[PDB]
């Protein structure tokens, strides 16, 4: 599923991401835009052999099991394929664990490089939330 901007904003808000650990909704929408282009089916292979999955590009090195990342952890206790569903529940629930681990949204490289320190409220502007 390729989400609309406002559609995803509303979905994320319903799942409890607005101000989660102090991060306003615009941060999450911006992160999703630059990580996946709002596409739940996005996958990208990393140099170390791990793979990033879904709308928030969650990494199989630490967070999910894809059966092909040796010595890796599954800290969200899910198969990586579940992060590609049109239903964002699994991705949101895992992201809540990630952003809570001490480093906040800096875990997402595109957030750090393209969202952090910008006017992120622009990403939810005009949306009926
Ligand atoms: Cl933080
Ligand atoms: Na893993």
Curated annotation (Swiss-Prot):
Cysteine-cysteine disulfides: 6-127, 30-115, 64-80, 76-94
GO process annotations (BP): cell wall macromolecule catabolic process; defense response to bacterium; defense response to Gram-negative bacterium; defense response to Gram-positive bacterium; killing of cells of another organism
Subcellular location as annotated: Secreted
Protein name, per record: Lysozyme C
Tissue: In the egg white and polymorphonuclear leukocytes.
Reaction(s) catalysed (UniProt annotation): Hydrolysis of (1->4)-beta-linkages between N-acetylmuramic acid and N-acetyl-D-glucosamine residues in a peptidoglycan and between N-acetyl-D-glucosamine residues in chitodextrins
The protein's assembly and partners: Monomer.
One Pfam family here: Lys
Record-level GO cellular component terms: cytoplasm; endoplasmic reticulum; extracellular space
Stated family: Belongs to the glycosyl hydrolase 22 family.
Keywords: Allergen, Antimicrobial, Bacteriolytic enzyme, Disulfide bond, Glycosidase, Hydrolase, Secreted, Signal
Encoding gene per record: LYZ
InterPro entries in alphabetical order: Glyco_hydro_22, Glyco_hydro_22_CS, Glyco_hydro_22_lys, Lysozyme-like_dom_sf
Main location, first listed in the record: secreted
Xref: Gene3D superfamilies: 1.10.530.10
Domain C-type lysozyme, residue spans: 1-129
Organism: Gallus gallus
Active-site residues per Swiss-Prot or TrEMBL entry: 35, 52
GO molecular function: beta-N-acetylglucosaminidase activity; identical protein binding; lysozyme activity
The enzyme's E.C. designation: 3.2.1.17
Its job: Lysozymes have primarily a bacteriolytic function; those in tissues and body fluids are associated with the monocyte-macrophage system and enhance the activity of immunoagents. Has bacteriolytic activity against M.luteus.
CDD domains listed in its UniProt record: LYZ_C
Residues the record lists as binding substrate: 101
Source taxon at top rank: Eukaryota
Miscellaneous note of the record: Lysozyme C is capable of both hydrolysis and transglycosylation; it also shows a slight esterase activity. It acts rapidly on both peptide-substituted and unsubstituted peptidoglycan, and slowly on chitin oligosaccharides.
């Amino acid at each position: 599923k390729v989400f609309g901007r406002c559609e995803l904003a509303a979905a994320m808000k319903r799942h409890g991401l607005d101000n989660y650990r102090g991060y306003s909704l615009g941060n999450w929408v911006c992160a999703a835009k630059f990580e996946s282009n709002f596409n739940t089916q996005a996958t990208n292979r990393n140099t170390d052999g791990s793979t990033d999955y879904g709308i928030l590009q969650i990494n199989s090195r630490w967070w999910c099991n894809d059966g092909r990342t040796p010595g890796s952890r599954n800290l969200c206790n899910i198969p990586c394929s579940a992060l590609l569903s049109s239903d964002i529940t699994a991705s949101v629930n895992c992201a809540k664990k990630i952003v809570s681990d001490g480093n906040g949204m800096n875990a997402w490289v595109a957030w750090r490089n393209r969202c952090k320190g910008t006017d992120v409220q622009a990403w939810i502007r005009g949306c009926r939330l």
